[PDB]
Amino acid sequence: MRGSHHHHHHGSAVSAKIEIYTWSTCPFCMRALALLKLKGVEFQEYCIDGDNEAREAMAARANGKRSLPQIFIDDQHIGGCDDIYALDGAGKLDPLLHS
């Protein structure tokens, strides 16, 4: 195991689970994607263009909301584009991404 390794009872290596549901061409989705990309974090985008079934799966997790985008971090519903930008402006987004 050659390398410079961090030990703190981590056990199996896991990380933040970051999810965003989008339409690719929605300007609010595009703005939220830009913010996540600028943070440099690894994240999963559920691009659901034209997919009603996926929108209903999204709504089932997002308090019935079908507005876009919808963002989850470690399985918690964060909200939409305005919500993530508001958190960042308050200095509260970085801690949630783990930093």
Author numbering: 1 to 99
Show me the paper's own sentences about this structure.
The overall structure of the R27L variant is virtually indistinguishable from that of the wild-type protein. The RMSD (root-mean-square deviation) between both structures is 0.099 Å over all atoms, and the Leu27 substitution was confirmed in the refined experimental electron density. Arg27 occurs at the C-terminal end of α-helix 1 of the wild-type protein and potentially forms a H-bond with Tyr74. In addition, Arg27 occurs in a cluster of other basic residues (...K-R-K...), so it is likely that it is part of a localized positively charged patch on the surface of the protein. The leucine substitution would obviously disrupt this patch, but little else would be predicted to occur. Crystals of the wild-type protein diffract to 1.7 Å resolution, while the R27L mutation produced crystals that diffract X-rays to 1.2 Å resolution. The sizes of the crystals of the wild-type and R27L variants were similar, so the increase in diffraction cannot be explained by larger crystals. There is a possibility that more efficient hydrophobic packing between symmetry-related molecules, mediated by the leucine replacement, contributed to more efficient crystal packing. This observation is essentially what has been described as surface entropy reduction (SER). The R27L crystal structure lacks two neighbors; the A75I and A79S mutant have no net differences, while the P84R mutant adds three possible interactions.
